[PDB]
């Protein structure tokens, strides 16, 4: 049962082993976490536009291979596009990226774990986690 | 079969009946047309921040219930990434959004209509169409 949705920087987190403790509760977590798409998306973007494309593609792939990877649904837009109207009535930017999977996870009842605890805790009902 | 992907501004266009030759070549392509999940996000911003969030979601929901929402999935994610990439190595700056959408018709081998082309138009291998 998927209890957690990874963003991007945890993502990376774990890959450079660095906070350590980051990649230790990924481990302890496996079979329980995934990522949107959009995160997808993000990964594939830093992996492509570096001086080695093909061996940080691989990367990127054998880290995903051990998660689920979300598609970005009607629900998970419409949560999107309801928290954007919501953060902007109350003068709360959010990063756009960051509000799509903010909305993702919300309309799978997932926590996100992201390091960026303050931005996401400026979302209403959701739920988010620091592993650093 | 699924042909185009409309940008957001062709789907308030032809709401709006303005230009009314938008609406028309709409209809005309009933069966045909489709939006990424990432543009369904910007129309229930668009409403739910409206003063008439229950009218305007309406409109919007009924709308797209007579086109396809395709979900947001690995091959758009992916798509994207290399996009962004290969516009970033150009210099030339896409909305987080439109890059996005860029990436999801691009993976569906789907012309993506628009209103302002030339942000599209320097997308590798995407094709477009100007409805305005």
């Not at 291979?65 to 970005?72: A, G, K, N």
Request: hydrophobic share 40%; aromatic share 6%; glycine share 8%.
């Amino acid at each position: 049962h998927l209890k957690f949705m990874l963003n991007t920087n945890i993502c990376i987190f774990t890959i450079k082993n660095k906070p350590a403790s980051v990649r230790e509760r990924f481990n302890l977590n496996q079979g329980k976490m995934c990522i949107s798409s959009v995160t997808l998306m993000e990964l594939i973007y830093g992996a492509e536009k570096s001086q080695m494309p093909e061996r940080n593609l691989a990367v990127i792939e054998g880290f995903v291979s051990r998660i689920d990877v979300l598609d970005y649904d009607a629900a998970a837009a419409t949560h999107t596009g309801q928290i954007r109207a919501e953060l902007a009535r109350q003068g709360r930017p959010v990063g756009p990226f960051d509000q799509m999977i903010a909305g993702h996870a919300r309309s799978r009842g997932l926590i996100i774990v992201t390091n960026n605890t303050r931005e996401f805790e400026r979302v209403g009902g959701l739920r988010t986690e620091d592993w650093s």
